[PDB]
């Protein structure tokens, strides 16, 4: 169980810049290290083997270094096609082991999210469940915090979120958070709010509605 600790887990860069990814082994693995690139829905592709030998067909912008326990994958003159996941692997000893991966995203100017809150539909309430949804639209960076509040009481554990991949045209992200409440709970309370914090917001933005009609 020779652990390969890979850092960072995520990182943002701009076209033309350099990227450095690190992998540290729990035991000396010599130079028996490989690096791979992987894009969503696809299998990994080999970039470097023997720690510094660039595989055929791979752009010279990719370079690997290291010997012993600390290895580095360096990407120079970053290009849009380099946006993907990268991971290391040691094959000095079995079982072979892999780094946890590093996702490389493209940087852009900070953009605050536009927030929208949606009450549950009357159609759904007939099912005994109430889904309240909060939308955070076209923001950057990806980091965002959504806090649900019912009658001003902080909700915990009853929400699930989903985030889109970086938009191809404007490089922003969007996220959806769904709060799941029983119909009885929803009917018992009045004020429903979604509080959002993000680098682009000077102060937290809260969207809210009161149950009624």
């Amino acid at each position: 169980e020779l652990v390969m600790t890979q850092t960072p887990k995520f990182m943002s860069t701009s076209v033309g810049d350099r990227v450095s990814i690190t992998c540290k082994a729990s035991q000396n693995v010599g130079t028996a290290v490989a690096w791979y690139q992987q894009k969503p829905g696809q299998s990994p592709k080999l970039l470097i083997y023997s720690a510094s030998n660039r595989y055929t067909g791979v752009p010279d912008r990719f370079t690997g270094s290291g010997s012993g326990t600390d290895f580095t994958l360096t990407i120079s003159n970053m290009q849009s096609e380099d946006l993907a996941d990268y991971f290391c692997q040691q094959y000095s000893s079995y079982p072979l082991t892999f780094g946890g991966g590093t996702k490389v995203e493209i940087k852009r100017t900070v953009a605050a999210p536009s927030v929208f809150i949606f009450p549950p539909s009357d159609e759904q309430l007939k099912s005994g469940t109430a889904s309240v949804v909060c939308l955070l639209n076209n923001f950057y960076p990806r980091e965002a915090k959504v806090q649900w509040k019912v009658d001003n009481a902080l909700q915990s554990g009853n929400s699930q979120e989903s985030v889109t991949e970086q938009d191809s045209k404007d490089s922003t992200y969007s996220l959806s958070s769904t709060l799941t409440l029983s119909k009885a709970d929803y009917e018992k309370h009045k004020v429903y709010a979604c509080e959002v914090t993000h680098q682009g917001l000077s102060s937290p933005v809260t969207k809210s509605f009161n149950r009624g009609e």
Binding site: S43, L46, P95, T97, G99, G101, F116, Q124, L135, S176
Partner: protein, 220 residues
């Protein structure tokens, strides 16, 4: 050159077993160890084991010793990996490849679940109400409680694509999936343009077009 072909997606119940195939071509199959790897969503790849097609000899990661069994069929140049007593943790994308190579199968996705085929319920995410706060409104469709994946969503029969965001599905505690599809449009368009989400759940051959409109207290 070297090609490794796996199956696509497979649904299996807990306690059952699955046998994944990897059809090789472009080289002498019996020459070259075949390795197998497991990949869970953002969980770092894991090496399962390897097999010598010529001798049938195998070596396993102790972690998968009691779950995976590697075999081969020389006549058909195919390598197989059988996973037994399946559990939710076995759900992942599995690949056949070599020690440290550029040759990989496309990956086979195994989903372990006790859930039964179910079409989704589509609920409206109605555009706010009253007046707009920024001239821009948001609306969408909550596609929930369906199994298995996937579901696809389009808007206005494909006439609407700009500003559309269809989120990755999420697995609910119930064992059923749910996902939302949204779109931002001018608030001034709510009374002149109809917005309909086209939802398709091929696994159940279910399709449904849902019109999304502002909520009105006057209507039933």
């Amino acid at each position: 050159q070297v090609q490794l072909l796996e199956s696509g997606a497979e649904l299996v119940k807990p306690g059952a077993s699955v046998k994944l195939s990897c059809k090789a071509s472009g080289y002498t199959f019996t020459s070259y160890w075949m390795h197998w790897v497991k990949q869970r969503p953002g969980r770092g790849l894991e090496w399962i084991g390897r097999i010598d097609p010529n001798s049938g000899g195998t070596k396993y990661n102790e972690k998968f010793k009691s779950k995976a069994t590697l075999t081969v069929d020389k006549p058909s140049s195919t390598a197989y990996m059988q996973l037994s007593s399946l559990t939710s943790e076995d759900s992942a994308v599995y690949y056949c490849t070599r020690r440290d190579s550029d040759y990989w199968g496309a990956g086979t996705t195994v989903t372990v679940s006790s859930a039964s085929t179910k079409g989704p319920s589509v609920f409206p995410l109605a555009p706010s109400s009253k007046s707009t706060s920024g001239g821009t409104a948001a609306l969408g469709c909550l596609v929930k409680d369906y199994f298995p994946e996937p579901v696809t969503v389009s808007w206005n029969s494909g006439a609407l694509t700009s500003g559309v965001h269809t989120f990755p599905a999420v697995l609910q505690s119930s064992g059923l999936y749910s996902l939302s599809s949204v779109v931002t449009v001018p608030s001034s368009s709510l009374g002149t343009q109809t917005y309909i989400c086209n939802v398709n759940h091929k696994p159940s051959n279910t399709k449904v077009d849902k019109k999304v409109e502002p909520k009105s207290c006057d209507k039933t």
